[PDB]
Amino acid sequence: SKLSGKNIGIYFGTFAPLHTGHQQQIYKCASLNDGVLLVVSGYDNDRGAQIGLPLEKRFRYLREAFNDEENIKVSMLNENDLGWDEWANRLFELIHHNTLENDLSVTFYVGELEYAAELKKRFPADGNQYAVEIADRHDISLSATQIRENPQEHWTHINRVFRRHFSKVVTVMGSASTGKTTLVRRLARSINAPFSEEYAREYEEAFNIDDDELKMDDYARMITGQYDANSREVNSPANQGIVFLDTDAIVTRVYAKLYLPKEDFEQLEPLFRKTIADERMDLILVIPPITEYIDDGFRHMEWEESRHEFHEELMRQLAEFGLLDKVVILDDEGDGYLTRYHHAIDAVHEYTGVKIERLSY
Ligand SMILES: NC(=O)c1ccc[n+]([C@@H]2O[C@H](COP(=O)(O)O)[C@@H](O)[C@H]2O)c1
Ligand SMILES: [Mg+2]
Numbered sequence: 140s141k142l143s144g145k146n147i148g149i150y151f152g153t154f155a156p157l158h159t160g161h162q163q164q165i166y167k168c169a170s171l172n173d174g175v176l177l178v179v180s181g182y183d184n185d186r187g188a189q190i191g192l193p194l195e196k197r198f199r200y201l202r203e204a205f206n207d208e209e210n211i212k213v214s215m216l217n218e219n220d221l222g223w224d225e226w227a228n229r230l231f232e233l234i235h236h237n238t239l240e241n242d243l244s245v246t247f248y249v250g251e252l253e254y255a256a257e258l259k260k261r262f263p264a265d266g267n268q269y270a271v272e273i274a275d276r277h278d279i280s281l282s283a284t285q286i287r288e289n290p291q292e293h294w295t296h297i298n299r300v301f302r303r304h305f306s307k308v309v310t311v312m313g314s315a316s317t318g319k320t321t322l323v324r325r326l327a328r329s330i331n332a333p334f335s336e337e338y339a340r341e342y343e344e345a346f347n348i349d350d351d352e353l354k355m356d357d358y359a360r361m362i363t364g365q366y367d368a369n370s371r372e373v374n375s376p377a378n379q380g381i382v383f384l385d386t387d388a389i390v391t392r393v394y395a396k397l398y399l400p401k402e403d404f405e406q407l408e409p410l411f412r413k414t415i416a417d418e419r420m421d422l423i424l425v426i427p428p429i430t431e432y433i434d435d436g437f438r439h440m441e442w443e444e445s446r447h448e449f450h451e452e453l454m455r456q457l458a459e460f461g462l463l464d465k466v467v468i469l470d471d472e473g474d475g476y477l478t479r480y481h482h483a484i485d486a487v488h489e490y491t492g493v494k495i496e497r498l499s500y
């Protein structure tokens with residue numbers, strides 16, 4: 140799993156994120172050399188680490204993004220503890236370890252004049268021919284900066300592996316037979332967005348059990364099962380920058396506190412914590428209890444009638460996890476906004492920046 144050929148090229152980047160600018164250059168470099176070593180640099184709290192893409196995560200995403208290439212290897216250049224001399228020691232250590240042959244024609248592709256200048260001073264006498272080539276990376280670096288500043292605006296250019304991280308997430312929460320499913324569908328269809336289904340609905344249909352028949356192990360199953368489903372939408376190739384999620388672990392954790400014995404709830408507690416902590420939410424739409432009884436079709440037999448009891452615990456728990464600043468309650472139909480959906484789609488506009496057409500003048 141090392142790089143073959145004589146003419147090999149070295150390409151640098153912080154890749155925060157990798158985008159079609161880098162890629163278009165990287166593939167050009169691959170057509171001119173027998174092989175290419177991508178070198179990701181980073182240090183704690185760097186520009187990428189401050190948006191949640193530390194060097195390690197960026198390196199793994201790169202390996203995944205180029206898992207397909209016979210002649211492209213991804214390598215890590217750890218710039219912690221730096222003083223150019225030791226930096227170059229590591230860089231040529233990378234080259235030596237990740238190459239197969241001797242008598243190489245190595246071409247560095249560098250974008251800053253300081254780097255090329257300090258690199259030319261330090262070619263070691265190891266049988267290789269070294270050249271440093273300058274590249275105008277202004278447009279690539281500006282693009283990566285624009286992407287971090289507003290990912291939704293430059294979404295199509297973000298490499299798909301990195302899109303996993305930059306997605307806005309809207310989660311709809313509320314007791315059943317309150318309209319969530321109609322709401323999630325219409326919100327997501329408004330902006331050509333993907334959406335998830337309430338997993339408890341699908342679990343209860345596939346396993347043919349009612350709300351009162353759920354035991355602890357069923358809740359356990361619904362936690363990881365709803366998360367997988369939401370994670371599947373977050374990472375969908377249909378995602379354009381915003382996804383909508385029909386409930387999450389908090390919802391399930393509200394039902395579980397309300398209906399499980401204390402001991403059985405105490406036992407799901409670690410899985411609840413781990414799952415809820417892994418949930419990135421940007422906007423939380425809460426549908427409050429109302430005397431409506433929507434019933435899109437399927438009836439949660441028991442998760443009705445005590446809607447206020449559910450809504451109080453739900454708000455209790457949303458506070459417990461410090462999420463209230465992301466929360467918007469759709470308290471309409473007797474409050475203002477025209478409909479529950481008008482309020483919601485406008486909140487989607489406030490929190491994600493997407494344009495929404497008005498119906499009237
Ligand atoms: N289920 C959810 O609400 C939710 C929200 C955000 C991310 N995720 C998942 O967790 C991961 C987040 O990765 P980062 O650590 O890069 O943010 C993603 O791969 C995604 O699939 C899940
Ligand atoms: Mg991924």
Ligand SMILES: [Mg+2]
Pocket residue numbers: none
């Ligand atoms: Mg508690």
